[PDB]
């Protein structure tokens, strides 16, 4: 009962901790439970189905509190696999990690809330989602690629920003008298910011052929400068994965 | 009459089966007949031209049933080219393939429908389109490239999802009292989901300068995080074709 | 007066013909005259400024007919530089090229129109724009890159098309009774086609939480599959220019 | 007091001038002061909060004039580090640079305005933003990448422009009689230009099944040709940074 003790310790703190193979199954399904619990929290908002959803939602709240209670327990046990955290002092200190203690705090809030309250449960659910990280890996990856392309990006942010201010001002001048949409500069900026991202709600549009004519030039330019940073970062991620691909195919 | 027998067997089960050269002509034109049959099925919906289209549509239904009846026949014959499926047992078992039997089932439904019915014919037409694959090659290609970029993508899905929930909640707080668009959280989420994809129907827009001010920041961020996965996959497909290009230029 | 004869022949049929250096100046400015002539043709449409624009437009029509008359003359003369088309037979046959004869036909139509008419002049102006090519180089380049990526693209066109038909049908079912936007399938297809491209006019939007819920899933998928082919072709052009870059840096 | 004199000269004309490390902190924070001063200039437009913002804005105007006055002073002093501009003649001529003299002119306008006026201060603030460059580096980078891809781009601009004119004309013909949106060609062009960029305000949309049918084809094409140049330039920037990456990893 030692090699089984020690084996299951290894593979469990493989799955619970940094997971490799089929542990992504478990990490996806725990994501599903926290996620669907957040969704039913949204169904609580509709007063026409508030009572029905609330019925099922306390129940799924039951299961979610039980799931993460046991997950907290099980990880603390299978954390014996750490060669630095072993037996007494390890497992008595491992729950002292930063993420772990905030995690137990979020979990205990989950515990009491079942023992104005819904604000608390919506937020703790969100921290389950953000609890997905435990490392900030996503933030690290995004920061790296944003850093590598700082000159190209800042080129796009500067030139796009200028096109916004310019086009908004011109349209404001041409359509300040004959239109009620463009009453003050702040309205012309809302209009510029909402066309250049190609959202185009339709609540403010120019209606004199001068406004149409000036928007039509800075539009053709600006809408393509607001769409660069998505294009630049998209290519950056793909290129970076190709390089990590080959580098890893060797080492 | 053997070498002609055997020649036309080869080139026909080249064209009907895995096609190389001018067989893409035939596969495109059969796609046209199934496609245009689906379109006339849509024209059936307009009651102002329902009768005219329905007139022509039973006729093109005639041709389509005849075409695929003969295609079923001709492929079963020219399937003698299979070195594993030869004469009796092959051609008597080749129609036992999974895709082939579902194909004959869809075809026989086509046969009876010309012998509440229009629901059946719209669906069988759809299965002609999905019958285009016979291999799931498109699904394989998409799955490969989605798999290769799982870390970059999940970075985008996580950070975009957070920006959605955050911006929707802030705008909901700033514009819950002075506006009828944002009545419940579920409305604020519909608004967030429809601006961040830059659809912008225009049915819900913020109208207090607090809502405009908070949307204008998470908008500039979010609309570019919802547009990544198209950008990442787009670069992924192009890069992958370049690598298959060179690799094949050798081997 | 021979070396000057022959020199200016060379550099002129350099500029007029396949241009290298500062001949792009001339080709841009001739593009400006044809272009601005088309624009004033559009100003003719507004009856409030029809007369003013029409005033200036016959005048710029004067200059444009004179410009291209002389260009036709000058190119036919400087075409002596062709080692195959020399003196009598060359310059007497060079105007027999396909593009040249259609060009003289368009020019002569320009001549007579100044000697229901505006339909003719709008069209001939368009053929000046399309006359920019003379080779179909742009069509060749686009066809090459579309050809190279046929498998990735057709993956996107197939999967996007399916998502359209599917989402439109589901939304049609959920919102056929409680809404006047979605009356027939053809309306649901117009709605699907206009959200998935993220145009979003706002004339048709779902208004029952079932329609919002089903659109919100196929939206998140579809809007990113309709945006691939721009992303794929965009990366394709950039990659191809890098390869032609290095290849030419050698040879 | 010489080595301290000379040391701080070096590191200061490192930070103020071409900055390397933590000088980006200072250059970001000076960007914040000019930027937030522009924003409060916009809050001046809303007459409901005009007085409150104007209150705080003269104050932040105080700090901004003092900041750039001292920056002008301090840079002129620490400009002794220039091996060509040293002591008397250098520091007496260094303020004779083009950017420096326009900068002092903008600064002195800032000085007098605190000693119809708001038009002047909004513009000078803008020139602080454009003063960020001092070199046109962003313009240089954009021009380089636009130049490198001139053939692919002009392919996109030509083919997209044709699709615009074509689709707008067809829709104009099909929906000129039965609709008030499309009254003249100029309206059909506004509609075409605003759908093809996927803005889609919603003020003009086709409403006869002929207009819907013709828009639906040139839409599927055009909206993807208007989105190329963002895609091409996006890939161009990313590719170019990868090449500068490796080249610099060597030299
Ligand atoms: C992808 C990460 O987030 C983005 O890079 N997005 C983004 C950021 C800025 C801009 N434009 C410049 C601008 C700056 C300030 C302003 F107040 C207004 C406009 C465009 C985009 N797409
Ligand atoms: C291309 C294949 O499909 C996509 O990757 N598309 C996509 C998927 C998700 C997101 N955002 C995150 C999100 C997640 C859940 C939610 F309920 C709401 C938002 C954005 C896009 N474009
Ligand atoms: C860039 C050159 O043109 C494009 O490749 N564009 C494009 C073509 C098709 C699709 N979707 C599939 C579809 C097919 C048929 C239909 F009737 C409806 C939808 C999307 C885009 N963007
Ligand atoms: C990124 C830098 O700016 C752009 O390249 N943008 C852009 C420029 C033109 C076009 N279309 C062609 C056209 C030309 C003239 C016209 F009067 C109307 C249409 C599309 C885009 N996106």
């Amino acid at each position: 009962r030692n090699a089984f003790y020690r084996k299951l310790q290894n593979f469990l703190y493989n799955v619970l901790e940094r997971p490799r193979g089929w542990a992504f199954i478990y990490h996806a399904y725990v994501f599903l439970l926290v996620f669907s619990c957040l969704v039913l929290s949204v169904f609580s908002t509709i007063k026409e189905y508030e009572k029905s959803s609330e019925g099922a939602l306390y129940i799924l709240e039951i299961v979610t509190i039980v799931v993460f209670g046991v997950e907290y327990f099980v990880r603390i046990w299978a954390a014996g696999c750490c060669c630095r955290y072993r037996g007494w002092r390890g497992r008595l200190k491992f729950a002292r990690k930063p993420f772990c203690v905030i995690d137990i705090m979020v979990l205990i809030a989950s515990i009491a809330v079942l023992a104005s309250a819904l604000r608390s449960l919506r937020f703790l659910q969100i921290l389950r989602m953000i609890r997905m990280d435990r490392r900030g890996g996503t933030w690290k990856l995004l920061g790296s690629v944003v850093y590598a392309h700082s000159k190209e990006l800042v080129t796009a942010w500067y030139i796009g920003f200028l096109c916004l201010i310019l086009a908004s001002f011109l349209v404001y001048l041409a359509e300040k008298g004959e239109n009620d949409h463009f009453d003050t500069y702040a309205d012309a900026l809302w209009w510029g910011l909402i066309t250049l991202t190609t959202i185009g709600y339709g609540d403010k549009y120019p209606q004199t052929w001068n406004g149409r004519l000036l928007a039509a030039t800075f539009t053709l330019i600006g809408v393509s400068f607001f769409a660069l940073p998505a294009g630049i970062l998209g290519s950056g991620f793909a290129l970076k994965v190709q390089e990590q691909h080959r580098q890893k195919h060797f080492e």
Side-chain angles (χ1 to χ4, degrees), chain A residues 9-154:
Chain A
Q9 196 152 35
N10 179 19
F11 266 78
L12 264 292
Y13 178 77
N14 165 278
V15 184
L16 263 63
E17 206 44 35
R18 180 84 171 287
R20 78 172 170 79
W22 296 130
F24 279 96
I25 279 296
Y26 175 77
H27 271 314
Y29 295 139
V30 57
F31 168 74
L32 265 288
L33 264 292
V34 283
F35 181 71
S36 184
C37 196
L38 199 148
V39 165
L40 258 68
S41 74
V42 158
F43 277 55
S44 169
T45 62
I46 320 171
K47 289 291 146 177
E48 67 173 294
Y49 294 89
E50 183 267 3
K51 298 185 280 184
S52 304
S53 89
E54 211 78 0
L57 178 154
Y58 294 98
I59 276 177
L60 199 139
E61 177 62 18
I62 297 172
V63 171
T64 180
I65 300 194
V66 159
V67 158
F68 281 1
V70 309
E71 193 160 18
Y72 177 78
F73 281 171
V74 296
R75 165 170 317 286
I76 312 158
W77 187 93
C81 183
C82 175
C83 309
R84 279 189 175 178
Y85 294 93
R86 292 200 154 205
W88 273 59
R89 179 65 188 188
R91 311 204 205 182
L92 272 62
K93 70 205 275 187
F94 167 56
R96 321 184 181 185
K97 293 179 14 179
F99 194 94
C100 177
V101 296
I102 284 284
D103 191 277
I104 194 48
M105 160 149 56
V106 160
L107 193 138
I108 178 169
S110 85
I111 307 175
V113 295
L114 281 299
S116 166
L118 56 82
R119 293 182 183 174
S120 78
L121 287 157
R122 294 207 307 186
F123 276 68
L124 297 175
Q125 294 303 9
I126 314 161
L127 295 176
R128 280 322 175 209
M129 293 297 338
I130 177 174
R131 185 263 308 183
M132 187 208 100
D133 273 320
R134 317 172 47 137
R135 302 152 206 166
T138 64
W139 298 98
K140 285 170 187 177
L141 175 41
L142 170 66
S144 176
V145 178
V146 175
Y147 177 77
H149 305 259
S150 306
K151 208 160 311 199
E152 290 103 2
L153 279 182
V154 163

Side-chain angles (χ1 to χ4, degrees), chain A residues 154-176:
Chain A
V154 163
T155 283
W157 292 344
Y158 176 77
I159 284 185
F161 165 81
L162 271 196
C163 204
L164 164 64
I165 277 184
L166 191 58
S168 285
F169 178 74
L170 289 191
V171 156
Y172 176 77
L173 291 196
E175 287 200 333
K176 143 80 174 193

Side-chain angles (χ1 to χ4, degrees), chain A residues 216 219-225 228:
Chain A
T219 280
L220 280 192
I221 308 295
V223 311
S224 283
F225 275 112
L228 274 191

